């Protein structure tokens, strides 16, 4: 099963499955080498964006009751910008 390294600005590496990551076209392109650097995106935000990916892939096309995806006020604006850039 294929993984990729998403590296934050503060240099935290995050290993997510290729699929979960391709949830962003922005990232699809950055890859189209198994690693991606984000000058603008700090760990605390790129952690939540990887959580969002796992969440998206799980609860998409599931007959199950789907839960709210939570965002603390403190990180809403940055995650928002990050979302906009990644287009996901």
């Amino acid at each position: 099963m294929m993984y990729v390294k998403l590296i934050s600005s503060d240099g935290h590496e995050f290993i997510v499955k290729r699929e979960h990551a391709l949830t962003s076209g922005t990232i699809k392109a950055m890859l189209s080498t198994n690693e991606v650097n984000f000058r603008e995106i700090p760990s605390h935000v790129l952690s939540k964006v990887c959580m969002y990916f796992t969440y998206k892939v799980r609860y998409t096309n599931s007959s199950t009751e789907i839960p709210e995806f939570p965002i603390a006020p403190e990180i809403a604006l940055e995650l928002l910008m990050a979302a906009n850039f990644l287009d996901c």
Partner: protein, 103 residues
């Protein structure tokens, strides 16, 4: 059930999932895949409790109510090589700014 995990070590963090009904030996065969270091050489912890290779993930306190996709449970990772034992060290994530005055 299913469980959603962050397996962390220093400035590395692995996003992965498994069944509540999974042994912590199973979770190390996954890590062996990614980091190329076999399970004998791995020591997994829930906060600061070493996890026994035979126990189930649900055994250790990893429920589907605690380890969701949107908020996965953290799993400490330190390595070992013969008689030398790397200490568990998890680098904390960046901080946000102060909430702008408008919020």
């Amino acid at each position: 059930m299913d469980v959603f995990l962050m397996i962390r070590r220093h400035k590395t963090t692995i996003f992965t999932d498994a069944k509540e009904s999974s042994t912590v030996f199973e979770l190390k065969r996954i890590v062996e895949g990614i980091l190329k270091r076999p399970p004998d050489e791995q020591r997994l912890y829930k906060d600061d409790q070493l996890l026994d290779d035979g126990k189930t993930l649900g055994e250790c306190g990893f429920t589907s109510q605690t380890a969701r996709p949107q908020a996965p449970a953290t799993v400490g990772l330190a390595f070992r090589a013969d008689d030398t034992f790397e200490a568990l060290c998890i680098e904390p994530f960046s901080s946000p700014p102060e909430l702008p005055d408008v919020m």
